[PDB]
Design an enzyme around this catalytic site. Structure first.
Site, PDB file in Angstrom:
ATOM      1  NE  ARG A 249      -1.516  -2.584   2.525  1.00  0.00           N
ATOM      2  CZ  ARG A 249      -1.638  -3.825   2.065  1.00  0.00           C
ATOM      3  NH1 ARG A 249      -2.723  -4.191   1.387  1.00  0.00           N
ATOM      4  NH2 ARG A 249      -0.683  -4.701   2.309  1.00  0.00           N
ATOM      5  CB  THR A 250       3.252   2.748   2.472  1.00  0.00           C
ATOM      6  OG1 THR A 250       2.323   2.346   3.487  1.00  0.00           O
ATOM      7  CG2 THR A 250       3.792   4.140   2.703  1.00  0.00           C
TER       8      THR A 250
ATOM      9  N   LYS B 274      26.606  -2.326   1.889  1.00  0.00           N
ATOM     10  CA  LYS B 274      28.096  -2.233   2.081  1.00  0.00           C
ATOM     11  C   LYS B 274      28.452  -1.435   3.349  1.00  0.00           C
TER      12      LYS B 274
ATOM     13  NE  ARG C 265       6.600   0.994   5.398  1.00  0.00           N
ATOM     14  CZ  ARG C 265       5.447   0.360   5.336  1.00  0.00           C
ATOM     15  NH1 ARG C 265       5.419  -0.960   5.240  1.00  0.00           N
ATOM     16  NH2 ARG C 265       4.319   1.053   5.370  1.00  0.00           N
TER      17      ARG C 265
ATOM     18  CG  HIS D 198       2.759   4.034   8.694  1.00  0.00           C
ATOM     19  ND1 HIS D 198       2.983   4.869   7.631  1.00  0.00           N
ATOM     20  CD2 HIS D 198       2.235   2.892   8.190  1.00  0.00           C
ATOM     21  CE1 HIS D 198       2.631   4.255   6.508  1.00  0.00           C
ATOM     22  NE2 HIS D 198       2.184   3.030   6.832  1.00  0.00           N
TER      23      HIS D 198
END
Lengths: 312, 311, 324
Positions: free
Chosen positions: A58-59, A88, A109, A137
């Site tokens: 969704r996001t 890395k 995110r 969120h």
């Protein structure tokens, strides 16, 4: 015509009642753009860089669709842990200073609480928090409140049931935070005792003059709410108390029987994904709003992209 | 007018008239791709991909197709790992979510039956990009299109289907569509243990298609317009390593095979290939498998165009 | 209009061949001057508010078989800033059909049917040249496993010219794993095309620059000096170009590891002895070999270097697809 008062979208506490109301109006103008036959050019020439360190449907896709529906372009990085030079050992601050060379806005995110705020402090371009590991969120909270306004027609004078894992539930905590900014709100905390809402949110609602009640009786609460907001309770939250798991079995499910006792103007919400905590036969009820809720995420994220990059 | 199909899911959706009409659209898509002007036919439309299995040809050709038409793409690869399908979300929930953000869904699932479930769920068109081990209809379309394009007709042709015929989804799907044409002859070339199953045999018989089975690729290839090659995975021989050894070197497209073929015949392969077509075949103008992959782009342009804006 | 001070006497195409970007030795002085001039025009496009359409209708295919942040995103940003489109493949080992055994030549002859230019970071040296020889469209080498990374060499030289204002007469310290340092070897190679360059090789003896690059610089009349003393060398350099030394390179010689400990670090003490108009460069990513507190110094040029990658890659895309 003027600059957005936020430079980044990171946390619920950046928002007051007036800001929320104004953003919700812009989301309605974005809904009209999304429904139009002709391609919007509002964000033509702007590039969004995504940085997904955890999975998302969704996001990730709503932000990308939002940018493209406004005529902007997107540079994606998913599994920034496997496919980015973050594999890395590169620090967040280095990733951010690198990626802002190539882009106009960053959507991130991360896996660690506090990452989004460090990103915003480091970057000289806007950052949007798309989920901050166990943290905030905030666009989920914005589209949740917007969905209530859109479905019920009001935020003042509503009853909202927050159901499931309230102790550890970031979306229920954040929704309670924002709903406390409107008048005459009642919140029902519906959960097994073992995952009841934490004192910090309880004391926050009291000090905001929000009435709240705790229950273990979803059928009772559901009959007098405008909104039932459902979330999963993970089996692992009962630890070794499988007696307590058995006692909760079948008691916090949204099924046809629960819709049977709900008002004709009430709705079912779920930030998604869902498993068996909402039965598939509920989806056919017009009051099942969780797919409309996900679509409202598109309009809310269009509004935030537009505001952060070109202002009001 | 509106395209008669709401979704592109299985070969059985197609009659020969519809195939011929799509191939004419594919030729119009080839002129668009060759032009120096950016097409705006699909300006403003968004395609969401859902790839649950790896892909090179299918994934990039669909994305190219959409962008050559001026549309945009929202990609999801390893929907098993980087999607919220990584937390147990049902297909029907993924589809109802993704359709809020897009105008057409292109899906390669891992399970046969997913694409028709997605089509039934979605209120936007769905294209099946490979239904795990099941239907791969756009491969079967680009295969038949490539034959029409290279040979110049589909009626009256001779096609060798070579390799794992027993288990071969792509050769079975190509046999299914070729039998819609007239006076077609099919040669089944394989080791006897991986011969074509009886369902396809009865299908061709009922369709009035002549067929012959053979383990002799050199004699068959001299008589064919098309040699459609596929790989025989060692696994298909199970515990019969003797039958594996007896097949070794006998089902290869190499310079000696091309030596017995007609000058206007072609080699096709859905790709990827390993050693079943030798590298030195590639220089022969009859080696059509890279042209075949590029024909996928024109077929997929035609389907996106037809499903979104019609004929 | 010549960056060298003189007026441009002729308006029309240059005299060089440029159909792929594969290796440093392609880049003669005429080509470097053209790429750097186009890069300065791209900095103006990138600054401007209106969307460029120079590459409208062109499609780039990426093939990243190794992880990348700067190279992958800068190429994609470069293409989109010029109004082009991008088809991405990262994890071309897991998410592409090269997970199922496909040869590189088959991947290239497939992908060229969908695209107008290919940008590839392979895991094996020599892949970029094989891809260029196979393809009938331009190929750019985005890092050829342990082989060349020519666009990094380009942006490194451009960064030096931009930050210092010259390439003739400069002093550059190459620091870190020189023996196995892809980017320092390629940078040394391009700097040797200019006049009165001095290069300092700063490293532990165990990872000193190979004789092939020393011999090349000697033959080209480039002065060079070896040192294990970064504090001495940094004070007389225009450029300190930093790279990591992996502990693995010491093998069983932990005595040698201990002796190198904290001797090859850019920190505030090193900046202290450096000239005001000197710079710190790093191709990135870094770990500890440049301390976070150096980033506030205006001489810390490694994020400006990364951005210059965008302008260089925009220039190459324009030169390869639409020309002069």
């Amino acid at each position: 015509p003027h600059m957005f008062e936020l430079s980044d979208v990171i946390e619920g506490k950046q928002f007051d009642r007036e800001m929320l109301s104004a953003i919700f109006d812009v989301a309605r103008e974005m809904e009209k753009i999304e429904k139009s036959s002709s391609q919007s050019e509002i964000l033509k020439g702007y590039l969004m860089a995504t940085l997904f360190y955890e999975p998302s449907t969704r996001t990730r896709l709503s932000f990308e669709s939002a940018m493209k529906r406004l005529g902007g372009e997107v540079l994606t990085t998913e599994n920034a842990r496997e496919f980015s030079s973050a594999a890395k050992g590169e620090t967040l601050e280095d990733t951010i200073r690198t990626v802002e060379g190539y882009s106009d806005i960053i959507v991130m995110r991360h896996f660690e609480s506090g990452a989004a705020r460090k990103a915003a402090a480091t970057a000289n371009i806007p950052v949007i928090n798309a989920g901050d590991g166990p943290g905030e969120h905030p666009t989920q909270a914005l589209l949740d409140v917007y969905t209530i306004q859109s479905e019920i027609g009001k935020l003042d004078g509503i009853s909202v049931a927050l159901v499931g894992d309230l102790a550890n539930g970031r979306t229920v905590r954040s929704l309670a935070y924002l709903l406390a900014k409107f008048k005459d709100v009642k919140i029902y905390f519906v959960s097994p005792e073992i995952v009841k809402m934490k004192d910090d949110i309880k004391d926050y609602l009291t000090s905001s003059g929000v009435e709240w009640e705790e229950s273990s009786d979803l059928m009772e609460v559901a009959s007098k709410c405008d909104v039932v907001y459902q979330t999963r309770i993970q089996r692992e939250r009962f630890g070794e108390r499988l007696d307590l798991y058995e006692a909760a079995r079948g008691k916090f499910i949204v099924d046809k029987d629960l819709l049977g006792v709900m008002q004709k103007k009430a709705i079912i919400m779920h930030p998604l994904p869902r498993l068996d905590e909402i039965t598939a036969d509920v989806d056919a009820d017009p009051r099942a709003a969780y797919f409309r809720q996900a679509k409202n995420g598109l309009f809310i994220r269009m509004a935030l992209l537009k505001l952060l990059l070109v202002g009001w």
